[PDB]
Motif scaffolding. Structure first.
Motif, mmCIF file in Angstrom:
data_model
loop_
_atom_site.group_PDB
_atom_site.id
_atom_site.type_symbol
_atom_site.label_atom_id
_atom_site.label_comp_id
_atom_site.label_asym_id
_atom_site.label_seq_id
_atom_site.Cartn_x
_atom_site.Cartn_y
_atom_site.Cartn_z
ATOM 1 N N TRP A 86 -12.010 -1.103 -7.952
ATOM 2 C CA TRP A 86 -11.027 -0.502 -7.064
ATOM 3 C C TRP A 86 -10.313 -1.610 -6.313
ATOM 4 O O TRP A 86 -10.949 -2.536 -5.798
ATOM 5 C CB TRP A 86 -11.669 0.488 -6.092
ATOM 6 N N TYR A 133 -12.346 5.032 -16.083
ATOM 7 C CA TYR A 133 -12.357 4.391 -14.776
ATOM 8 C C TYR A 133 -13.728 4.467 -14.119
ATOM 9 O O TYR A 133 -14.473 5.432 -14.304
ATOM 10 C CB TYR A 133 -11.327 5.044 -13.859
ATOM 11 N N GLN A 134 -14.045 3.452 -13.317
ATOM 12 C CA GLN A 134 -15.255 3.502 -12.507
ATOM 13 C C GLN A 134 -14.889 3.959 -11.102
ATOM 14 O O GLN A 134 -15.206 5.080 -10.690
ATOM 15 C CB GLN A 134 -15.955 2.139 -12.461
ATOM 16 N N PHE A 135 -14.193 3.102 -10.380
ATOM 17 C CA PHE A 135 -13.682 3.370 -9.045
ATOM 18 C C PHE A 135 -12.246 3.879 -9.167
ATOM 19 O O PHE A 135 -11.771 4.047 -10.304
ATOM 20 C CB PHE A 135 -13.804 2.087 -8.222
ATOM 21 N N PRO A 136 -11.522 4.161 -8.076
ATOM 22 C CA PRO A 136 -10.130 4.632 -8.234
ATOM 23 C C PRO A 136 -9.300 3.617 -9.003
ATOM 24 O O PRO A 136 -9.194 2.445 -8.604
ATOM 25 C CB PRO A 136 -9.633 4.786 -6.789
ATOM 26 N N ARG A 165 0.448 11.172 -12.637
ATOM 27 C CA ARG A 165 -0.018 12.195 -11.718
ATOM 28 C C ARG A 165 0.444 13.598 -12.127
ATOM 29 O O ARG A 165 0.089 14.572 -11.455
ATOM 30 C CB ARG A 165 0.454 11.865 -10.295
ATOM 31 N N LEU A 223 -3.505 4.778 -11.371
ATOM 32 C CA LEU A 223 -3.019 5.894 -10.556
ATOM 33 C C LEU A 223 -1.743 5.535 -9.791
ATOM 34 O O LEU A 223 -1.068 6.428 -9.273
ATOM 35 C CB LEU A 223 -4.107 6.330 -9.574
ATOM 36 N N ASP A 237 -8.663 -3.061 -3.220
ATOM 37 C CA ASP A 237 -8.649 -2.744 -1.793
ATOM 38 C C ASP A 237 -7.222 -2.774 -1.248
ATOM 39 O O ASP A 237 -6.718 -3.823 -0.826
ATOM 40 C CB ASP A 237 -9.552 -3.697 -0.997
ATOM 41 N N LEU A 238 -6.585 -1.599 -1.224
ATOM 42 C CA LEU A 238 -5.229 -1.452 -0.705
ATOM 43 C C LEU A 238 -5.105 -1.905 0.745
ATOM 44 O O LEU A 238 -3.990 -2.188 1.197
ATOM 45 C CB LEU A 238 -4.788 0.013 -0.807
ATOM 46 N N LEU A 239 -6.209 -1.913 1.494
ATOM 47 C CA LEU A 239 -6.199 -2.219 2.917
ATOM 48 C C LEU A 239 -6.468 -3.688 3.226
ATOM 49 O O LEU A 239 -6.461 -4.062 4.402
ATOM 50 C CB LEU A 239 -7.227 -1.342 3.647
ATOM 51 N N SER A 240 -6.703 -4.523 2.213
ATOM 52 C CA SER A 240 -7.062 -5.925 2.430
ATOM 53 C C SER A 240 -5.799 -6.687 2.816
ATOM 54 O O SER A 240 -5.126 -7.295 1.984
ATOM 55 C CB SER A 240 -7.726 -6.512 1.189
ATOM 56 N N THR A 241 -5.492 -6.658 4.108
ATOM 57 C CA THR A 241 -4.275 -7.247 4.654
ATOM 58 C C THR A 241 -4.461 -8.724 4.991
ATOM 59 O O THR A 241 -5.435 -9.104 5.645
ATOM 60 C CB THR A 241 -3.823 -6.489 5.919
ATOM 61 N N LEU A 292 0.745 3.818 -3.196
ATOM 62 C CA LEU A 292 0.315 5.205 -3.014
ATOM 63 C C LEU A 292 1.431 6.185 -3.344
ATOM 64 O O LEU A 292 1.195 7.197 -4.011
ATOM 65 C CB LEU A 292 -0.170 5.424 -1.582
ATOM 66 N N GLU A 293 2.656 5.899 -2.888
ATOM 67 C CA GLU A 293 3.801 6.709 -3.292
ATOM 68 C C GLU A 293 3.942 6.736 -4.806
ATOM 69 O O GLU A 293 4.383 7.742 -5.381
ATOM 70 C CB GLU A 293 5.081 6.157 -2.662
ATOM 71 N N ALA A 312 0.820 -1.216 0.000
ATOM 72 C CA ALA A 312 0.000 0.000 0.000
ATOM 73 C C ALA A 312 0.858 1.272 0.000
ATOM 74 O O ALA A 312 0.604 2.205 -0.771
ATOM 75 C CB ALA A 312 -0.955 -0.029 1.195
#
Lengths: 399, 399
Positions: A241, A194-197, A207, A201, A243-247, A171-172, A167
């Protein structure tokens, strides 16, 4: 050469044999699977020493998400787990014998999902696309690792060292040159719908102010640009999208079939249909079974960057075979592409084949890395003298 | 002190007068609006003479998105546009006279939506929450700028110089210390319950491995932790994904009422209800009208960082008043908090009041910034000797 618009749709987490392997009875040329010479994997457990699990055609529409980390895929393709206290990064022998065991290790009973594929009639959208256009049955995910390293290859022919969905790193942003930049510098257009993020990106260069304007909300812009013939030279459809948080939650193949049908029909009724080459592939195989050994010989590291510890991955092995479709009125129906007549004897079709083929069709000056420079190119799938005129206007609704 | 769990929900783009201003008829103590002494703004145009637009109670559930950039808000609060060729960063006179003009400038006819508020009966979820708990009618958005600088303040008491929704900057992440880190270092728990990708990911420090585990899918984990009384000490409910790529579409207030209802009822049926302090506020006012002059005196820059050009914003002025709710069985129903009692004569309630009050209630050692240290704290809203036992069990369904 008639192709002026290249459209790319990257689906999620499915192997070739799982999605299309049973399409072999529709065309023996497909390197799929049969009931009479069946594929299998064995499962060891506390209760049972050994159980043979046959690859069947009973895939349900809803399935859990099997394991597809680099460490899971190591066990799937080599038939033994990674051991950080006894590291064996290049064991030599991808016999594809560990899918059922890795599934069971991740979740009891999950070998049933991992060891099953779909009947052709259970996926009518795909059955029609296979029968009316082309597929590649020798197209490997770029990385034997998860979603994002593979998605990074799709538009840059490298993961810049990544073998996980980190993640902080995503993001960086990853700074390598993208095919979008190659195109832009040469005066060609591109658009990301795109639909979701969107995962695109995660490319840091997109960017910049001048590139952020090339992203367009799908619902607003995609069908509209298709209708009025205003699609740019390189179209990316981004739907989910990440899920960057799906750990291993369950989900439905139907949503992806509906998306393919919608995207196809919008391109098919477009005034640009006769200049369009539409590629569908999967980021990686999701941990589902496939019988074709992942190439381990002559696979170059794209940029000299190794993966993080403990694997320190050398990017010297490809990922598992995924379903890939080539769709264009310039393609003969029912065509099956195997390995490339790629530039080198050990060249392979993989995600870097997409930037490679874009570079080839648009005569861009340079390849992005050593991987697109080596990957097979598929521009030769365009074979007709005139575009076919009776390509299906609509596809069947998913069951 | 009975408060052990603090829950924070930040809604989007609405001013105090627009949302709660007509509740003054229900409670004269509320600094709202009346029909007999009505608020108004004037509009200048080419074809037509100067036109007074009176603040009414005819807000529809669906409205466009008015302007809420720092430059729009400058015109809204000072009654004249920003002028980069004659820059006037501190003009002195927030007379709140530019909402209608700025609305018309952004979209013809939009002054009607900007100069209207809701009848109390049109928002039953809010009307019931107001009558059964507390609101603050002197709570200002931290920044007279857009969504993300204000959201940064909610959990860090600074925007680290930000006055826009800069996609590249947000993805790179803002590195200031957060209230999450203050809590964790002091041995307290925190949880971020998200639906789509949360804006809290824009805090760079939360991307560390040890903090990424505190993010939980809302649908999976929130109602669950509410049932088993497992809520951490600081709960953030994150509901919408901010479209970083959106360089005035309509949307519905009803979705927010439904979410507020769901969150309230889940906290209300929780075994932790008797230790809970639930705060609802809005990131900023969305460009909708409010009559209360934004404070310009004694407002400190949190960390000495200026905003980007051309505004070079000094963070010496607050944003517009937003609706803020305090919800807990220890709260006297129908309570209205005005300005703060200290810590300083020019202190104000604002988003930094949330970190300040968390620091106060949990006796954390240090404030995060000069804003945190200066903002009003609202712990005195907890006034009862015993928790109220007949708090509404369920709320009305939104119209």
């Amino acid at each position: 050469y008639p192709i002026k618009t290249i459209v790319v749709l990257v689906q999620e987490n499915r192997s070739f044999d799982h999605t299309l392997g049973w399409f072999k009875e529709l065309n023996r040329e497909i390197d799929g699977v049969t009931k009479s010479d069946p594929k299998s994997n064995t499962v060891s457990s506390s209760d049972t020493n050994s159980l043979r699990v046959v690859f069947g055609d009973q895939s349900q529409y809803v399935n859990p998400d099997p394991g597809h980390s680099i460490q899971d895929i190591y066990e799937q393709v080599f038939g033994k787990p990674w051991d950080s206290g006894k590291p064996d990064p290049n064991p030599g022998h991808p016999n594809m014998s560990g899918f059922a065991q890795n599934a069971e290790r991740n979740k009891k009973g999950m070998s049933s999902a991992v060891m099953n594929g779909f009947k052709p009639n259970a996926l009518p959208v795909y059955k029609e696309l296979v029968q009316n256009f082309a597929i590649c049955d020798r197209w490997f995910a770029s990385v034997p690792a998860s979603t994002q390293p593979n998605r990074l290859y799709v538009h840059s022919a490298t993961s810049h060292g990544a073998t996980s969905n980190d993640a902080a790193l995503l993001l960086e942003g990853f700074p390598q040159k993208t095919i979008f930049e190659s195109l832009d510098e040469a005066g060609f257009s591109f658009g990301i719908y795109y639909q979701f993020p969107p995962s695109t990106l995660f490319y840091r260069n997109l960017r910049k102010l001048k590139y952020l304007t090339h992203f367009h909300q799908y619902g607003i812009q995609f069908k509209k640009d298709c209708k009025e013939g205003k699609l740019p030279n390189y179209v990316v459809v981004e739907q989910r999208w990440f899920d960057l948080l799906s750990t291993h939650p369950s989900h439905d193949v139907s949503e992806g079939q509906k998306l393919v049908k919608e995207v196809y029909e919008a391109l098919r009724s477009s005034p640009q249909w006769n200049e369009i080459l539409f590629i569908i592939t999967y980021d990686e195989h999701g941990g589902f079974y496939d019988h074709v050994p992942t190439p381990v010989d002559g696979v170059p590291n794209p940029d000299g960057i190794l993966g993080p510890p403990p694997y320190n991955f050398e990017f010297n092995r490809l990922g598992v075979r995924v379903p890939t479709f080539f769709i264009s009125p310039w393609i003969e129906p029912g065509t099956v592409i195997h390995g490339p007549n790629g530039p080198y004897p050990r060249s392979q079709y993989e995600h870097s084949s997409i930037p490679a083929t874009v570079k080839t069709i648009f005569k861009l000056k340079d390849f992005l890395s050593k991987r697109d420079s080596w990957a097979g190119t598929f521009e030769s799938v365009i074979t007709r003298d005139s575009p076919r005129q009776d390509c299906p206007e609509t596809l069947s609704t998913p069951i």
